[PDB]
Amino acid sequence: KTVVVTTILESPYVMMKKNHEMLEGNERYEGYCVDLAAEIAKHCGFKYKLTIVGDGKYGARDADTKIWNGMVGELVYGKADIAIAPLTITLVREEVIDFSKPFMSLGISIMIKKGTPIESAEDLSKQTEIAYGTLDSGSTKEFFRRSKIAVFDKMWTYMRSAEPSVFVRTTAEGVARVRKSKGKYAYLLESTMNEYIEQRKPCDTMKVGGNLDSKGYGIATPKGSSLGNAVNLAVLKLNEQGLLDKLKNKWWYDKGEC
């Protein structure tokens, strides 16, 4: 009866409260997705427990073992009832789990250390001085692997063969590498996260250019789950009553340090 919610530690969606040691259950966490979970739970009339995905991944199918990892895996193998996180709606995932309508729009975007002479993906592709990479597991990497658009395939060819690895294990690892590399590393990441990091100290990064693509984050449930329909109606309700915009502002711009 208590609904197990799988999610991921990724600011500002889900963060440990300063003092989580003294708190328990859901109280240990805070963020956009924590607020959204409370709201969905409330408008669906269920009680829930938040849990952080064990392997810290979003969800991909291993080619060899054909096994699903990450949050998607937790839903597929029945370890969780619902996932509320910055989880991208994709065709390959839609084939094994259900998604609500998107609660947030976004696209792949470019993060640079301020001053870097890059204005676009095309710019990145036509040069080698400035290295670039992505979160080495998720829909961003997958976007580039699969793309048939020339500029993106050109970038993918570079990135897959670059040594040392241009790929990073976490978003933070990616930001730090931008910040620390005197403008010789650029980072391709989802626009929402780019915009968030842009308003954080030391305020030395920026988003350049437009998004390379358009997609959305959705709340996921196991196929044929009994929560799917209600959860979906809830996201639509909360979007129309302005909540989702409220929450974006609270966690992005009301907190802005720049």
By CB under 6 A, what part of segment 138-177 binds ligand NWD? 138-140, 171
CA 132/CA 180 separation, integer angstroms: 14
Q: How far apart are CA 236 and CA 157, in angstroms?
A: 39
Q: Which two tokens stand for residue 169?
A: 């294990």
Segment near a second copy (CB under 8 A); pick from 7-15, 34-42, 153-161, 208-216: 208-216
Check binding of 193 to ligand NWD (CB under 6 A).
yes
Binding mask of the shown chain, residues 114 to 143, with x at each position contacting a second copy by CB under 8 A? -----------------------------x
Supply the minimum distance, in Å, between the C-beta of residue 218 and a second copy.
Answer: 8
Q: Which is nearer to Zn ion, 16 or 130 (CB)?
A: 16
Query: For ligand NWD, which residue of 6, 10, 76, 83 counts as binding (CB under 6 A)?
Result: 10
Cis geometry, peptide bond prior to residue 222 (ω within 30 degrees of 0): no
Site string for a second copy, 71-110 (x = CB under 8 A): ------------------xxx--xx---x-xx--x-----
**Closest approach of Cβ 52 to Zn ion, in Å?**
12
Residue 192 has a CB neighbour count (10 Å cut-off) of: 20
Q: Would you say 145 is a known binding-site residue? A: no
Q: C-beta of 96: minimal distance to a second copy in Å? A: 12
How many residues lie near ligand NWD (CB under 6 A)? 13
Q: Which two tokens stand for residue 175?
A: 């930001």
Q: Does 66 bind a second copy (CB under 8 A)?
A: no
What DSSP string describes the chain? -PEEEEE--BTTTBEE-TTGGG--GGGGEESHHHHHHHHHHHHHT--EEEEE-TT-----B-TTT--B-HHHHHHHTTS-SEE-SSPBP-HHHHTTEEEPSPSEEE-EEEEEETT-S--SHHHHHT-SSSEEE-BSSSHHHHHHHH--SHHHHHHHHHHHH-SS---BSSHHHHHHHHHTTTTSEEEEEEHHHHHHHHTSTT--EEEES--S--EEE--EEETT-SSHHHHHHHHHHHHHTTHHHHHHHHHHTSS---
- The answer on whether 10 is annotated among ligand-binding residues is no
Ligand-binding site membership of 102 (annotated):
no
- Provide the token pair at 232: 């979906």
**Residue 205 is a binding residue for ligand NWD (CB under 6 A):** no
Q: Binding to ligand NWD by residue 86, rule CB under 6 A?
A: yes
Stretch that binds Zn ion, among 12-20, 53-61, 98-106, 168-176 (CB under 5 A): 12-20
Q: What residues line the site for a second copy (CB under 8 A)?
A: 89-91, 94-95, 99, 101-102, 105, 143, 146-149, 213-216, 218, 232-233, 236-237, 239-242, 244-245
Q: What residues line the site for Zn ion (CB under 5 A)?
A: 16
Q: What residues line the site for ligand NWD (CB under 6 A)?
A: 10, 58, 86-88, 135, 138-140, 171, 189-190, 193
